[PDB]
Structure 1
Amino acid sequence: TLSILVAHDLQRVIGFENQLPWHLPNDLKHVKKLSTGHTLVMGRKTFESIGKPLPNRRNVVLTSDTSFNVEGVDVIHSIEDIYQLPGHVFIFGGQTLFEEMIDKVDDMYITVIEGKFRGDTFFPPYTFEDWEVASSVEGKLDEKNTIPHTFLHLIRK
């Protein structure tokens, strides 16, 4: 299975200045739970943003940099390489990867951040005419998680 994982706001903002625009611990927990024991494919900028591979999953970084060789990280240099990765593969970001992969993935696990943030990077437009809502679950709010959010699982029709 090839899936997208993304958090985007009401206007599809995903990032600002190479970081998340929001602080939402529950989204990180969501991502950790979904991808544990599986594979994440991410662009170079997303990797550098996180700073280190995420433990207990295969971390794959897509880059043109032939000098890229980081401990605990597997490198690929082509989109085509993604299709040779075994198991459940999650497209992890960022904008460039999402733009390249949205027409190719089987499904998407989206956290809709129900606010309007300043962004410099976006998830591409998509329509529910193409995507069946497998599930929609409202995120629970508390003092650590104060922005309304909804977890969608969308499957390509």
Structure 2
Amino acid sequence: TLSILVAHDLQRVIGFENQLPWHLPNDLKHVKKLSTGHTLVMGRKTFESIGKPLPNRRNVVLTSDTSFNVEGVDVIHSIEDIYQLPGHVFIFGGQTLFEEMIDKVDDMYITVIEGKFRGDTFFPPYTFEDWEVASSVEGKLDEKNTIPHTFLHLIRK
């Protein structure tokens, strides 16, 4: 079972200067809830941004660097390694990985950030011609969570 897990804004921005462009604690809860007890696959830059492996799941980082051997983290050096990994695997980011995997995965858990941010990295265009909406849930707003956002589960038609 292979999934994409991603938050993108109205113009498919995912990233600025190796950080998330937005502060949205709710979305990272959304992320914790989905991925706890399974597997993330991420590119090296995304891991560096995060700076340590997420607790209570398997962290796998895809990189060319053969001297990568970080405690708590498993390394892979090819895309094709992903399909070996057992269980529910979430493609975690960033741009490069989403590009390489979007045609490959079963389904996508998307947070649409209902806003327009300055970005330097993007989720690739996609159509709902190709993707069925299994669920669409409004994120709830409050003092800490102030950008409107929608949780999509899409399944490849």
SS of residue matched to 1:30 = helix
SS of residue matched to 2:119 = coil
- Tell me, which stretches of 5 or more residues in structure 1 are unaligned? none
CA shift at 1:87, angstroms? 0.3
CA shift at 1:3, angstroms? 0.1
> What TM-score results when the alignment is normalised by the length of structure 1?
1.00
Structure 1 ranges of 4+ moved more than 4 A? none
Q: Are 1:30 and 2:69 matched, yes or no?
A: no
Structure 2 CA distance, aligned partners of 1:44 and 1:51?
Answer: 10
CA shift at 1:141, angstroms? 0.2
User: Alpha carbon RMSD of aligned pairs, Å?
Assistant: 0.2
Structure 2 CA distance, aligned partners of 1:38 and 1:8?
Answer: 22
CA shift at 1:109, angstroms? 0.1
Q: Deviations over 1:107-156 (max 9, x none)?
A: 00000000000000000000000000000000000000000000000000
Q: Look up the match of 1:124.
A: 124
Q: When the two structures are aligned, how many residues end up with a matched partner? A: 157
CA shift at 1:97, angstroms? 0.2
CA shift at 1:14, angstroms? 0.1
SS of residue matched to 2:67 = coil
Identity %: 100
CA shift at 1:96, angstroms? 0.2
Q: Look up the match of 1:68.
A: 68
